[PDB]
């Protein structure tokens with residue numbers, strides 16, 4: 203009966219953003235070192251997102267939606283405290299942590315669909331107006347970013363403490379190869395459903411080293427996710443906008459490496475989208491191969507997670523360019539985390555009613 | 561000694577956004593009709609932007625900058641009132657209005673450089689921090705949009721009341737031709753300064769009518785301005801990023817006509833720009849062939865003026881895409897005007913100090 207106390211406590215600390223080099227410059231760089239770090243950090247991150255949740259209108263709070271998820275977090279917080287007074291050295295005290303993490307990770311595995319159900323409930327219970335959309339957008343973006351950051355920590359621990367890969371991090375990720383894979387997987391799905399699929403063209407632009415293949419330090423599963431989701435969209439649009447013609451244009455991808463950005467552009471000729479609807483494509487509310495996801499909004503969070511971004515620009519009547527912006531240097535790849543402050547509080551005080559433009 | 565009274569009065573009305581068809585569906589569709597309309601509308605628009613100005617920190621207000629501009633507006637407001645009690649019918653009462661407009665237009669001809677000087681004063685007098693930049697950005701965007709809308713009305717009147725063109729509006733503007741012209745003009749300047757210039761390639765994509773040339777109802781001088789400024793940028797970047805190589809890639813432009821958007825993409829290989837600096841490119845504060853302008857921020861306002869937009873996306877180490885989004889239908893081309901309300905008031909109450917992200 204002390205969850206509200208714990209939350210209040212760790213909710214005072216701010217989460218510690220880690221850089222990808224800190225992840226790399228790390229089997230047995232001591233997990234005691236990780237154990238003692240995660241015992242404090244996970245509780246701080248869990249509490250911060252839980253603190254935010256609790257200050258949500260009760261009309262959002264009371265839904266089985268938010269309450270169920272909010273209950274998983276309460277149990278995960280309690281789940282990880284058991285170790286606050288423990289002591290490493292005991293090769294058994296830290297093997298119960300690893301199991302404790304795998305159990306917590308799986309306990310939250312179905313959050314996205316669960317939260318999506320609360321969005322739907324809200325849409326039909328109170329309506330879908332710009333303000334409620336902005337508030338939901340603001341909240342889900344932070345909530346999901348927070349979740350991604352917690353899952354990164356956990357996966358880093360479980361994978362490292364079960365050469366080349368350091369957990370989920372590839373210090374020599376060959377971007378083009380990940381592109382190829384996300385593409386092949388997308389093609390397979392596209393072929394089964396439409397029995398026709400667009401081809402792939404890839405071009406690299408290594409600014410400083412003209413011919414060297416483009417490599418980077420990154421979390422490949424994350425990159426794959428983004429590319430795979432973008433490929434599904436481009437394929438759908440290309441195929442559906444050409445079912446009456448035969449010509450089926452290719453999806454072109456360009457990978458450019460600059461002094462600080464590593465950019466990936468995916469170009470299609472799927473008819474494009476009206477500038478006015480482009481804005482709504484990243485909306486959880488308005489957006490509730492295709493159908494499950496929260497493909498774009500969540501792919502974007504993955505890009506932002508390490509100071510990157512994911513932007514879309516279309517040319518109605520022609521095609522769309524989807525661009526993934528990542529940091530080229532591991533020094534600049536630092537976690538982007540949302541924090542609870544007096545600052546984050548007033549973003550929920552939106553009292554909109556008659557704007558500044560006519 | 562009654563300017564503060566007038567301002568307070570017309571500041572109660574909201575400006576009336578006009579659509580491009582209303583401009584088109586109009587020598588002598590009666591200027592009496594225009595005279596009586598402009599007598600009320602100009603004062604409403606002048607007063608609204610003047611009302612906004614007056615609520616600016618006194619530390620901005622007191623600068624010779626804002627005070628000089630603020631004095632021109634005071635005189636223009638008074639300049640146009642003289643006609644409030646007049647009576648048309650008198651072919652002389654409305655010819656003094658036309659002269660009164662030409663005189664007011666020229667009285668404000670050097671606002672941009674004047675305001676730019678206040679920005680500079682501010683930069684050195686108080687510093688260039690994110691908040692002051694946001695406030696200045698918010699204010700100058702609205703101030704300049706307002707000015708563009710007033711100048712549109714005035715030019716429509718003076719030109720119509722000195723076939724094919726209805727004032728500054730071309731009901732059959734051949735986009736590609738304007739592109740060609742802005743390009744030729746840019747090339748000439750580029751050749752003189754760098755004695756080398758990139759070529760031009762144009763491609764059209766008329767969705768509904770595959771081969772028909774792309775035409776639209778628009779204000780060509782506005783389109784020219786945007787294209788010309790974008791061409792200068794692309795030329796500079798292309799030339800300067802290839803002074804050590806010989807190959808000099810072309811600037812490619814694509815014009816796409818969709819059901820509601822008319823999009824113009826200008827692609828270059830001028831090395832591109834880091835995603836992080838792209839954001840600052842449209843900033844008046846941080847941004848104070850090249851040097852005078854306020855090229856991007858103001859070209860953008862022209863795009864937004866009729867519900868369009870102007871976006872930039874780069875690929876550091878390769879090139880940049882600048883896109884102009886315009887409404888394809890004259891029905892959707894309605895003035896975008898900034899208005900004074902309790903809503904516009906609280907955008908200046910930015911008390912930022914420690915954000916919501918760590």
Ligand SMILES: Nc1ncnc2c1ncn2[C@@H]1O[C@H](COP(=O)(O)OP(=O)(O)OP(=O)(O)O)[C@@H](O)[C@H]1O
Nearest residue numbers: 435436439472483491492493494495496497498522
């Ligand atoms: N390249 C594209 N061309 C045209 N429309 C696109 C493109 N990418 C996305 N869209 C539009 O934006 C919406 C999709 O965003 P998103 O990827 O988030 O969801 P989805 O594809 O519908 O389902 P899923 O969750 O699987 O992704 C699409 O439903 C489609 O209408």
Ligand SMILES: Nc1ncnc2c1ncn2[C@@H]1O[C@H](COP(=O)(O)OP(=O)(O)OP(=O)(O)O)[C@@H](O)[C@H]1O
Nearest residue numbers: 793794797830841849850851852853854855856880
């Ligand atoms: N296509 C481009 N490629 C690379 N950098 C660009 C491009 N377009 C703009 N920029 C950058 O953004 C800045 C320019 O914005 P803007 O056009 O507003 O001003 P300017 O060219 O410097 O002077 P001017 O007022 O004449 O336009 C440039 O100074 C340049 O650094």
Ligand SMILES: C[C@@H]1CN(C(=O)[C@@](C)(O)C(F)(F)F)[C@@H](C)CN1C(=O)c1ccc(C#N)cc1
Nearest residue numbers: 218220224225228235236239354355356358359
């Ligand atoms: C041990 C911590 C956390 N860590 C890890 O890789 C993991 C496997 O433990 C995990 F991903 F799960 F987090 C590195 C970023 C190094 N590291 C630090 O550099 C660190 C940062 C801040 C502090 C403090 N105070 C202590 C250590």
Ligand SMILES: C[C@@H]1CN(C(=O)[C@@](C)(O)C(F)(F)F)[C@@H](C)CN1C(=O)c1ccc(C#N)cc1
Nearest residue numbers: 576578582583586593594597712713714716717
């Ligand atoms: C006469 C007004 C203004 N007008 C003009 O073209 C000009 C030349 O007068 C100018 F550009 F300077 F504005 C058209 C948009 C038609 N028009 C209207 O359609 C209108 C709109 C609202 C009202 C009102 N009340 C009256 C008329």
Ligand SMILES: [Mg+2]
Nearest residue numbers: 434435492497
């Ligand atoms: Mg999708």
Ligand SMILES: [Mg+2]
Nearest residue numbers: 792793850855
């Ligand atoms: Mg310029």
